[PDB]
């Protein structure tokens, strides 16, 4: 099929360096969860190191396994929790593994055998997702890791911000103050990370001792975290173009093989597509895997259609698609079917 996502290696490389420049971070870990935010887990993970990425962050065990089976030897962090019965699997594949309880560590100590697990302690400061929420619980975990240094390596500690990209920083300040109170006077490991896209771009200077690592996704994928409210859109480069081609033309209406089942959601109805440097109106409704557009004149089968990207003097951006549909850029890209053809340009 002609419907494809064309990922730009040079744009990813540009955004990585720009993120490090603004944040001051010397280490950048790219969030590649959910098929690399829809850009392609394997293709982005393959070119990541060449693009200046120091490590990869996945959400679940299987995304990390897929990266390893593809031959990629990069540093991998699992952001979310994993079932304790899989602790030996996480150790074998050398994953920095997120742990949320002392009970988890106790159960892991019994099954690791001769293996050593790289541990990342989750601290809950307000996201209310996973992690310890008291200084006692955090201290108990650190002590256990030191008591069983044969089975564990205390390598990371982190928290995640619920609103580091929000113009209203009240909750951010509450989380930041809670973070510093919790870690105060405790043994810190080699990786002390808290900076997501919003924190790296708007709050880096407010985070001393924890601003050397950028654990980011959104900004590196060329999307301004607040979408141009708190920072400049122009300084970031879009990392992909979504293209297709006409499969049928009738006397003028052209049909292209993309629909809601592919991620071109019903909410994108009437968002004009680009053909030969011209904006083209939609004809009818977006079907499951096909849709139609009004052509200015006759075009042959195989004529390129640009849905997201540049054509002539015009450009279809993720920002404009958000304003049109109500669907945030990261949600637009994640919704692109993992079945769609993906390539690196």
Ligand X SMILES: *Cc1c(COP(=O)(O)O)cnc(C)c1O
Binding site membership: which residues? 129, 288
Contacts of 209 (CB under 8 A, 6+ apart): 192
Scanning 202-210, 227-235, 251-259, 313-321 for contacts with a second copy by CB under 8 A, the matching segment is 251-259
Shortest Å distance, C-beta 325 to a second copy: 12
Q: Which of ligand X, a second copy, none does 338 bind, CB closer than 5 to 8 A by kind?
A: a second copy
Q: Which of a second copy, ligand X, none does 215 bind, CB closer than 5 to 8 A by kind?
A: ligand X
* Residue 33 appears among annotated catalytic residues: yes
Nearest-angstrom CA–CA distance, 303 and 133: 57
Contacts of 173 (CB under 8 A, 6+ apart): none
**Catalytic option among 9, 20, 26, 33:** 33
Nearest-angstrom CA–CA distance, 345 and 333: 18
Question: Whose Cβ is closer to a second copy: residue 13's or residue 199's?
Answer: 199
88: contact with a second copy by CB under 8 A:
no
DSSP class per residue in 33-73: HHHHHTT-HHHHHHHTTTTT--EEEESSHHHHHHHHHTT--
Question: Whose Cβ is closer to ligand X: residue 40's or residue 217's?
Answer: 217
- From the list 27, 163, 269, 272, which residue makes contact with a second copy (rule: CB under 8 A)? 163
Nearest-angstrom CA–CA distance, 253 and 297: 9
Q: Which residues of this protein are in contact with ligand X, per CB under 6 A?
A: 31, 33, 79, 160, 196-198, 215-218, 288
Residues in 192-231 that interact with a second copy by CB under 8 A: none
Which residue number is nearest to ligand X in terms of Cβ?
A: 217
Residue 302 in 3-state DSSP?
coil
Shortest Å distance, C-beta 218 to ligand X: 4
Shortest Å distance, C-beta 33 to a second copy: 6
Question: Whose Cβ is closer to a second copy: residue 212's or residue 226's?
Answer: 226
CB-CB neighbours of 4 under 10 Å: 17
Residues in 66-85 that interact with a second copy by CB under 8 A: 66, 79-83
Tell me the per-residue interface mask from 257 to 296 with a second copy, x by CB under 8 A, - otherwise.
Answer: x-xxxx---x----------------xx--xxxxxx----
35: contact with a second copy by CB under 8 A:
yes
156: contact with a second copy by CB under 8 A:
no
Q: Which of 193, 218, 279 is nearest to 38 (CA)?
A: 218
Residues in the chain: 345
DSSP class per residue in 166-222: -S--HHHHHHHHHHHHHHTTSPP-SEEE-B-HHHHHHSGGG-TTS-SEEEESTTTTT
The annotated binding site for substrate is made up of 129, 288
Query: For residue 318, what are its two tokens?
Result: 């993720």
Question: Whose Cβ is closer to a second copy: residue 27's or residue 166's?
Answer: 166
CB-CB neighbours of 255 under 10 Å: 17
Nearest-angstrom CA–CA distance, 107 and 71: 30
Query: For residue 58, what are its two tokens?
Result: 């996945």
Q: Which of a second copy, ligand X, none does 218 bind, CB closer than 5 to 8 A by kind?
A: ligand X
- From the list 5, 61, 99, 207, which residue makes contact with a second copy (rule: CB under 8 A)? 61
Scanning 47-55, 128-136, 145-153, 199-207 for contacts with a second copy by CB under 8 A, the matching segment is 128-136
CB-CB neighbours of 175 under 10 Å: 23
Distances (CA, A) of 146 to 95, 149, 157, 214: 19, 5, 14, 27
Residues that bind a second copy (CB under 8 A): 1-2, 33-35, 37-38, 41, 59-63, 65-66, 79-83, 86, 89, 100, 124, 126-130, 133, 162-163, 166, 171, 247-248, 250, 253, 255, 257, 259-262, 266, 283-284, 287-292, 302, 327-328, 330-331, 334-335, 337-339
Catalytic residues: 33
């Amino acid at each position: 099929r002609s419907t494809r996502i064309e990922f730009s290696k040079s744009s990813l490389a540009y955004n990585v360096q720009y993120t490090k420049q603004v944040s001051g971070a010397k280490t950048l870990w790219l969030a590649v969860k959910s098929n690399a935010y829809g850009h392609g887990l394997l293709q982005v993970s393959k070119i990541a190191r060449e693009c200046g990425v120091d490590g990869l962050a996945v959400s679940v065990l299987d995304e990390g396994i897929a990266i390893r089976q593809a031959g990629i030897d990069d540093f991998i962090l699992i952001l979310g929790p994993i079932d304790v019965k899989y602790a030996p699997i996480a150790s074998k594949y050398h994953f920095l593994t997120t742990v949320s309880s002392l009970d988890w560590l106790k159960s892991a100590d019994k099954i690791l055998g001769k293996e050593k697990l790289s541990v990342n302690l989750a601290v809950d400061t307000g996201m209310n997702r996973i992690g310890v929420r008291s200084k006692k619980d955090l201290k108990d975990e650190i002590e256990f890791l030191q008591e069983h240094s044969d089975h564990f390596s205390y390598d990371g500690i982190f928290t995640h911000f619920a609103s580091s990209d929000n113009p209203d920083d009240h909750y951010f300040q509450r989380q930041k103050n809670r973070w510093y109170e919790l870690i105060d006077g405790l043994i810190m490991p080699r990786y002390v990370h808290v900076m997501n896209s919003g924190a790296a771009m708007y709050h880096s200077k407010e985070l001393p001792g924890c601003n050397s690592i950028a654990r980011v996704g959104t900004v590196v994928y060329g999307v301004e975290p607040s979408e141009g409210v708190l920072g400049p859109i122009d300084k970031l480069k879009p990392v992909f173009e979504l293209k297709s081609a006409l499969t049928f033309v009738k006397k003028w209406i052209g049909t292209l093989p993309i629909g809601y089942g592919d991620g071109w959601l019903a909410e994108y109805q009437d968002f004009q597509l680009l053909i030969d440097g011209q904006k083209c109106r939609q004809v009818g409704q977006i079907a499951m895997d096909q849709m139609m557009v009004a052509l200015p004149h006759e075009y042959p089968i195989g004529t390129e259609v640009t849905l997201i990207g540049k054509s002539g003097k015009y450009e279809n951006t993720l920002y404009d698609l958000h304003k049109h549909s109500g669907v945030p850029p990261w949600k637009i890209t994640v919704a692109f079917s993992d079945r769609l053809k993906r390539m690196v340009v």
